[PDB]
Amino acid sequence: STGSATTTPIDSLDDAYITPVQIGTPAQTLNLDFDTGSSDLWVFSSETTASEVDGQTIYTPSKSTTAKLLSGATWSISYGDGSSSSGDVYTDTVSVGGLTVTGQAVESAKKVSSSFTEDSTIDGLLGLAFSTLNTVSPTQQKTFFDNAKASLDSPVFTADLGYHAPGTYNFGFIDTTAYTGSITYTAVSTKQGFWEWTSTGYAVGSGTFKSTSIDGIADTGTTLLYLPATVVSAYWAQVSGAKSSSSVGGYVFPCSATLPSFTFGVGSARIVIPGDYIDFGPISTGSSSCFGGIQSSAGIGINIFGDVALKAAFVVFNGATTPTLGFASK
Template sequence: MHSSLYFTLTLCFATLLALAAPSSKSGIQKRSFIVKRVASPRLKARDGVEEMAKAFNKYNIPVPRDLKNAVEKRQLKKRQLAAANRVGKRSVSQRGPQRRDDMGGEQNVRLGLAASSSQRRSQLAHQRRDSMGGDQDVRLGLAASMGQRRSLHPRQDQDPAAEQTAATQQPAAEAQAGNQTQSKAQGGDQNGSVEATPEKNDAEYLAPVKIGGQELVLDFDTGSSDLWVFNTQLKNQQPQQPGLQTGGQSAQQSAQQAGQLEKAIDSHTLYNPQQSQTFKEVPGLQFKISYGDGSGAQGTVGMDIVEVGGVQAEQAVQLATSVTGSFLQDSKNNGLMGLAFSKINTVKPEKQKTFFESVMPSLQEPVFTADLRRNATGAYEFGTIDRSKFQGDMVFTPVNNSQGFWQFTSERFAVGDGQPQQATAGGQAIADTGTTLILADKNIVQGYYSQVQGAQNNKEVGGVTIPCNQQLPDLMLAVGDNMARVTGDQINFAPIEDGSAECFGGIQAVPPGTMGIYGDIFFKSNFVAFQGGSNGQGPSLGFAQHA
């Protein structure tokens, strides 16, 4: 009897163990399968390669072949992960065609994934030409001489007759509103500030803006002059399939692309002009911005009350009806606040003032400042210079705004506390909060990295890389007749891949004859003031070391 009872208990215990053991058909195994298909966070995160290519494309500078190849490899890997992710979802859910794919990266939203191998080859070939510079290298090549340097403007499709600036002619949007742009206060007493929050790797700094009382987070960009936003009109946008014939798309593919586009748009905060009591539609005005990588925005224009940190003005607001490329994928960014000069505003037939130009007469001081910090919240402030934010004296340099930028001479540099060295004579640069890296004269880049042990021109990533554990010297850059310090710790941008011992350098070279672009790497070392000019004085740029 005891043996029978022992046998029964043993059998029950074994049965319980078997039930507790994971089964190939268990939910745990299914969840594990899905997790393995999730796209790598490394590929979704921004890195130096993408940021460098983004800056080149922003200004339609021909993309070097090695950088072009590096970006294509990353995009190919994204597409492969997207395809594997869809296969995994279909095998698990049996609903593959109906599932939205949010792992496809920007190319899947803009282009979709071709159904056949022949379509896929056609798609990739077209993307290489349009998105990565290809044929544009000949079409958009820069003049070799400094005197013939072409503008760094995005392609605007602007008529020559429309080059008249908003500063010298009343914009049509303001005329439609019935008066010149009116600010909240006419006594010159406005000032205010907003926080500037960095995304991963300080790829961009985003700040809140109220338009018609609705708050959106925008990228403040001193390298452009358009205030354009994601808005409810985008609900009518149709998927675009560059390089593919619409007739070759199956209904299933079209539905998938429409779903991806809808999801990308819904991930943004949308401004709704119909919910604004102060919005005024302005018929006849339109804008179109396109960059070298195929991304861009276009749409209509209206007037509304725009407020930044309590500073407000009635302002032209560009309402995108179509947005493509990386703008769609950056769900935290709901548009651009351009803070350069209206000469490069893309609204047709008449250019519009920037927000700073609109509020400048009503500010305590005709100035705004950029206080950007590494991996920390900074601020943009209008109407005053907070002297507690910097140390020592702030020095100012006259700005040449003839091309629409905060442009200055930069023809000298020094490494650490060494003697100043000559870069290209007459070299020019612009201050651009909308660019992540510093893109500088080749002589500056070569002279700096020659003093960094282990630095190399890495063809695999299309730029200079450095050992991540290398202590870097400071770099001194000429801003007019003054020298600005960029601390070495800011120049070590980020690993080229997660876990890599090689890091992408925060300073990279531009082609000969191209103006330098001093982006956020520069700003993270310096408190910068953008002085609009007054009392007969032109605009100027001030800087000092962070406090």
């Protein structure tokens, strides 16, 4: 089997991407944030504290003939941005782009933090990291991909995120029309539960490539590119007037700037992020200070190849017995 679904930016900045997901019988379609940095499929629901729902579409398990309470199971998750959610668990039928999994754990939120409430466009998350990170207790649950894997034509999924445009998540096949040149594969460590890999270096604009190992995670659920302070300083030093602002929470730059590109290495291959991808616009409405899309990972504890990086590539998440990651230009 295979599946193919379009993923759409939630706003004009590509802050996140939503993908329609069918849950239950008859189908309830919710727009979920596919997140290769976590491993829980959770949804706003009829159980979510009413004051914490503001415009989201909810899953109502009592209206699904295939929903079953997973008795005794609870979940609770906290994300890198400080947001969180928790609740109980149902199993139900879940379909993505025509690919169906029966008995998928659908984690129903009883509580969500303010950041989730305040974003009416995201109805929940669909985790695509390794199932070892799943938070369901006392019986850990598998991700949608893990459950689908054996049925897939090939044990892979691909992320093809757009810049200010829709893109695609495919399951079970590699669309050879969706990228240019060849795909370069690189080793993955699953030791921390992430799609963790080592970039071979970087360049800023038309500058020379610096060969240096940068361990980080491929994370579709993180908006920006978070890299070591040395690398980030080298990038922003090429933008007149750019500076790190503790008050704003990272590097800002004059909105009048033209940003240089940023290249990262994948083995001997190179992925070029155009400068425009690094512009996250005014820090507040009407400001002439703009927020940068490359930020320091210092104090996160891990480097994160988030959407800014991933959307410059066609990315293969190869879930074979020994997982790997593939990157192609597009």
